[PDB]
Amino acid sequence: ARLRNIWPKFPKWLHEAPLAVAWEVTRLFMHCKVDLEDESLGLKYDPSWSTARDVTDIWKRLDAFRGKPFPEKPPNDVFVTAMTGNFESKGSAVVLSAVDYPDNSPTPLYLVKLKPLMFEQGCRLTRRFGPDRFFEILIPSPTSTSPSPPVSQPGAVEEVIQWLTMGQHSLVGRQWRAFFAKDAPIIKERVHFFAETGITFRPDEPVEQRTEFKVSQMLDWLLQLDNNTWQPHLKLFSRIQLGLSKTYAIMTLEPHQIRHHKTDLLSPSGTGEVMNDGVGRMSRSVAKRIRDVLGLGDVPSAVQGRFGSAKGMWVIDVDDTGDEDWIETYPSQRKWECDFVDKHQRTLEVRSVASELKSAGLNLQLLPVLEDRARDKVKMRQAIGDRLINDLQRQFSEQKHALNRPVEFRQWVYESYSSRATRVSHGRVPFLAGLPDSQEETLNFLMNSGFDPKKQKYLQDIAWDLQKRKCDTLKSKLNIRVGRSAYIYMIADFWGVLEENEVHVGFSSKFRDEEESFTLLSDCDVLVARSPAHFPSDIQRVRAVFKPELHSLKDVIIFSTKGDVPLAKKLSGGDYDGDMAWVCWDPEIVDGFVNAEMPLEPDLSRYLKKDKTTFKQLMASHGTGSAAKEQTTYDMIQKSFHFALQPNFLGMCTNYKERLCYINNSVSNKPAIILSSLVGNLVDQSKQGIVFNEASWAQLRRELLGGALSLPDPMYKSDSWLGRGEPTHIIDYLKFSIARPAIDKELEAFHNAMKTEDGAHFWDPDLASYYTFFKEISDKSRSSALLFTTLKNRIGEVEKEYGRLVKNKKDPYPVRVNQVYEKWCAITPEAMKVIRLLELSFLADREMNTWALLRASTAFKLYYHKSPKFVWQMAGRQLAYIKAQMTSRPGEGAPALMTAFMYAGLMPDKKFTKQYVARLEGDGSEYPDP
Amino acid sequence: APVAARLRNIWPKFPKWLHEAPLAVAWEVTRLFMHCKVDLEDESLKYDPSWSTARDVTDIWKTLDAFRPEKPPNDVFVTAMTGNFESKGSAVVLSAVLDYNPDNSPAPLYLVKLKPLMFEQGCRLTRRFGPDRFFEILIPSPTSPSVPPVVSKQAVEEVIQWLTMGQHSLVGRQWRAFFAKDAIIKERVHFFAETGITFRPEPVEQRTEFKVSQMLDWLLQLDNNTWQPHLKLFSRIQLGLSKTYAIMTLEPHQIRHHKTDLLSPSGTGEVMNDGVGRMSRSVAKRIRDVLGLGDVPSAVQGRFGSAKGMWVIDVDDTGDEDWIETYPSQRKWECDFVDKHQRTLEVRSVASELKSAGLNLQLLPVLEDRARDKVKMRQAIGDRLINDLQRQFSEQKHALNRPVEFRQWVYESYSSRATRVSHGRVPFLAGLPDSQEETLNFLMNSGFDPKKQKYLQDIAWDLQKRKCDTLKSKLNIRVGRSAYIYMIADFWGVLEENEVHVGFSSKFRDEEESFTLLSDCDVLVARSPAHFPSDIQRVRAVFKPELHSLKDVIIFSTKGDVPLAKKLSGGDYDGDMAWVCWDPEIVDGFVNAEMPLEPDLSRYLKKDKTTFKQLMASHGTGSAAKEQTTYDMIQKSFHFALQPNFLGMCTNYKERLCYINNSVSNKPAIILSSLVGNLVDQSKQGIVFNEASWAQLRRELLGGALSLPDPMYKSDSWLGRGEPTHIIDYLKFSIARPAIDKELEAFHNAMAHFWDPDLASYYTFFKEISDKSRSSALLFTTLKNRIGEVEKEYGNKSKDPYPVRVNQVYEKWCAITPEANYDSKVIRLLELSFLADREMNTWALLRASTAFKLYYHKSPKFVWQMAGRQLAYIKAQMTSRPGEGAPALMTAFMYAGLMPDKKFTKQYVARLEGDGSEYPDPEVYEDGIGFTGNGDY
DNA sequence: AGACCTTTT
RNA sequence: AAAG
């Protein structure tokens, strides 16, 4: 249809090119809108392209590309490894990535843009078959609603699925067949392709001598389909995620070092419930290898990983006394019947490790359930608001005090935000014209050279702008800070030492709150929950008990394997395969909470349909033998693509839940439990085969939830109280009755304070030192006077340019600033013996010359009060030099001229700031080195 | 006796001109007169009214024909003037040093040198009676070569009288002596201002006349302590002088005075809680708040009234009420706890984050003695030395390959925050930082590579040599799984005998393994010094959740016959720290020994037990009798304190003999260990041990009058016959010395010139000017020759100290200036007159550059020490590239507040080593959730 | 063959 | 300069 002819043609003159140039050569043709199946250019393969280490070399002279724009270039390390590294480098895989619907012409549905070559973390499938044989795209689903579409035909969804799954796709000399799809402004889904055949493929192992292999065979290698025909084919397709999961290959274990359990840990109450879903033990030696190959400073107590068909958490055996390598699996972890024979089905693959915990706070989503469970809902609301007002008042107060002393404000500006990542990537603080491009680095840059925010109004104004903006972000983003809270990986107690409703929490280091610190939790009640929390029982109050038996297990929370039901299931139906629990030991949050029982979930079979058709049932429609199994696999893919590309009712029903519970001000009434139970059965929609369409979502809303098809937005979604009377919902109350008035009071104070000759000014006699010293010379000279007059006028012309291009009002703002800065640097002695001393030519950077100091000093005096931004935008660099030189005092130490790189590697000494202000306040001798 | 004639006019004379003067100037006007040798009584005189309201010493001192020292810090001076000698706990100290005068004419025997006004942490007595009323001196001991003949003939008793029988007059004040302790060997003596011209029979210059006999009665309440031996009583005055941070004044109803210590459950009567009591969690929180601590301290070392010792948080305190308890073992005298200064918690130290310790020479003999396989123990300790050396050198050699990595390493090798805070800048000697670490980072921050510039290479070479030479001498073999930790008793009876509880306030790191507590392992506990074979004990670490709150402390059981602390060289829980080791390679071969059968040395150890009471029956009863007895106690105890200490001689003897015998467990070793154990407590326990007693003990039990030779390891090289067999000889000469020489050759081999075409670019710039200008050539020429004269002055093996010598040469270096050389437009551009710091002008750069060219190889230490600051400026100017960022000129103060960011180094080097797409280390790449995976599947 | 050690305010 |  329109879809046909969408893919780029491979010109038959690159048929010998390595696929690395072939991918990058096919990109330049696209971006430069040039056909490649034409003799118009007379193009032919330059053998110089093989052995290349830069894509730029390949791109470099002909008519059709002369002057056209260049596309983003793949980085050299990826290209080198692409050409000479067999697409793998240090556990990373070179990725063939691509990504849209704009011309409504009846005869190409999509505009395809190939994305550059790039490194990403490999997976089992790329480590077994080669990264070059995998290709991913981002394509918009036919089952979305926002209109960008021609959709406007009934069977388009089937047609789109037919294009991707029915047959092979030709690109870069390789035949790509689709094997997986999952959801990643329009909703776009990620589709994965495998290179089944190619030009350089042997019809029977380096990148260019790949034996032809079919997707049906690749998937049969991963899932061992013969022994898993009993599985529903939609769940079988979902297990392909385990093969695509970006994991760190750790080690390969031998069959005799693997303990396949046939039974899970079941409830001691005979209820049959599994108390260890997704969790197994590993040896202390295996954990040590995880540390060694990943570069960690400590043996991880627990890891999230995969191992053959097994998926979940693995935790150190506290009772491991030897140093023999081993690992165990359970049925709850094993997602398909696997023989664990190939070394890739026996490699421990780590997704992440349980690392040090940082404070989580209390996100607003939990407050309705915490309010539903408060023994006194009026005190809890009062306490949460008092906590918020105090935190806000503390934040605003701590800012104003730091402004009084420049060493203290430097801490604050450093603590407030973070530029390390930018400093590492640029090897320096990046500068826009004459100042750092960020406002935080500009404040610290200028204060490092002696400028005071309480004295220099340019600094006062910038510090004013950031606090205005922090205030404006605090009333769109509401944050209830709870120091004694963290998200922690959930682990089960294999050793039966934890009683029902007892939990073990030990930290790997000091967990700091303002007034207390912890290395473990003991003899206190804690609140555990999984986010999001829906049912009133989705948050549970339990007893933290520190068991010395488990002391070695750190940065995990351990739940009891006693009792009727595992605690992880009561937390929104969770388990121990990577789930994290919100853990709160803040007494003010815990002591009000009363536990609710698990609700009676309603029967929603009338609305929720499950397709449980097995691989066997899908295969018997084709017969028996290899070719039948091979066809059923391709069917499994196609039938699963319709389901994956279906609408996201999990998101729609969750947004309805938020609104329903808001307008009703209830999370425990019958509508809320029905909705919570519904979104619970929709988390696994693709996996457990839940077919749920708009019409089923229509009945349920009208029949069972209150009749409303569409519910209003909650008021807290707006940034101003558009409600009637005092807020009633707890979140509305916290945003508009507590936070908003408090933020406003500081903003009012800000303008009122902004409104005396006693204050911060633009003028600084230090900054005009060079202007005056020359005037003394110029007034007694003729030559100096001419240079001075020419320079002063020259600065004026650039100031005029700044006003038109940057101040008053196309080309982007940084580019305009740079254009004026180019003219600013252009002011020079050459354009008008003294000239040599000012120029200092032996210096490569003209900006480091004395001329630049005089140019800055002269521009300052002439424009410090009419055009302040112009002087600092162009010459703050030299203004800071002048300030540091002028403020130096003989015998009072020595200023230091840091290089750009060495500067970016320094940070404020927190212990210096505290200790220095202490000495100034007369507390000269207090307790040392803490 | 005359000494007595030379003990007349010792203290400076107080004229009538300064009678009105405040103690602050009267002290410091006296100081200058003495330094410049101008008599206070010179008629060749009016008080300056300006001096009374002065806030700076230079104003005092500038106010004259005769005048052509160290100045009291300007803040301390204001406190002495207007803050009543007391600024936020710190006290202004009146100090002085006395030496024997070379003049042998029987003129003053001692030469006084009043030390400048300074700040020190106050104490109970200064806070109660005023810091102005206390004077402290260092005086030579009269019981000591170099001793003057007048003292050598006849003298000790004549000096002691001069100190104790009368008041001495200084700065308008009459000072009586009240305490003395051992600081030629010198003794520290403390005085109390009993009267003065300004005194009357509160303000500093309006002080009621108070006597030493009463000052001591307030502190010790002597009426209720006549039963104590008067020497022990005198030693308790040190509790009133302990430099302490006053935390809070507790009320009487909050103080629980226990009357019976915790005793052994076996009926032996042994005390299991000596020096240790409990405190409320609230009291601990105020300690945190008053001292500015980040966390709540579990345990503290302090004093409360008559109580001295450790106070630990009560783990059962669920309330918010402030309370403290005292025990008999803590209370050093009968106290009523009525005055608020006798009810104030005073803290000397708080239990804090522990650091890894090192093995010491004292512990190794005992460790070998108790080893079941000595060969294994030796191999392990040596192997620990060889691998510890190998890491140190490998960590540094790698670090030298990148300036950002070596700056990180230098910053981590030494912490200079205190000197930075103290000065508000990095202290500079001439044109480079004082410290070597700070010199390296200063030059690296301006663009110098420590592997390309030889001057930096030589500094790091010299610095690593000094540490290696220290490891040769000390053998402080670092052991990661070890630390010194305050000892505490288990009030709650959950620990069994030989079970200890150790929990850390944070992660304690040892290479591969890290710990927040100790559990299920054996540990070694020992107190330094270790002498007896029983002075180290193998015990079991058991973590008890009931004691989880107590951190950075080691808890011992209160069950069992004898407290484990007592088995550690007779230690207790009043401040004692234990060497704690959980290294399996060190712990698992140790076999405990029973406490030693100490021999009777009463024959030579004479214990004066005279009580205050018997000392007073020579006077009768009543206040006048008490006052006399208290002044008797001072004089008699000064006699005992000023007496020679033989612990150094007897410990040095035990070392030399036990080395000869290679045994710390035979009869002479038990004898000498028992002897040194009594000598440490001599002043408190009143044991007289004369030279004759040491002579008699040596001749009857220990080898006689023979002077024992020094052990081999006291020498740098093995001059011994054969192969080293003593474990210290073995480790220093067979292990350390060869391994250090091998790691050193590798270090140098890995490591580069003094020349730098950038550092000589200003020289070249004016070389091209001086050719087309005879005037510029004259300046240029004059400047060159001026530089050489300074270099000659710098250079040879000098009574003046090294910094003073360098500063002198530096001042003639800065003297070079554009003095007349005729084109003024140029002289001004070089001069940069507007700048106040002349070392910031363009001339100082050229002076540095020109010096560099004429002397990069010749005398290299000259140009760097003088002009290294300007050499750094030229480097950072030259190495700047257009558009590649901006160099930064940072003030001295702001520079001292920055530090290297470990996370920047690790991220930058990882990004640069190609391998930056691997696992995100949480400590390098930090709702609080970090890395949870690379994708979604 | 010649007068202690340890780690911190 | 302390403390053990």
Ligand SMILES: Nc1ncnc2c1ncn2[C@@H]1O[C@H](COP(=O)(O)OP(=O)(O)OP(=O)(O)O)[C@@H](O)[C@H]1O
């Ligand atoms: N008979 C069955 N009927 C329905 N679902 C089943 C059946 N047997 C197993 N399952 C499903 O198999 C899935 C395998 O668990 P899996 O680890 O994939 O889920 P999860 O713990 O929710 O995942 P994650 O926390 O890693 O996002 C479960 O969701 C479970 O419901």
Ligand SMILES: [Mg+2]
């Ligand atoms: Mg699971």
Ligand SMILES: [Mg+2]
């Ligand atoms: Mg899960």
Ligand SMILES: [Mg+2]
């Ligand atoms: Mg004691």
Ligand SMILES: [Mg+2]
């Ligand atoms: Mg005692």
Ligand SMILES: [Mg+2]
């Ligand atoms: Mg003690």
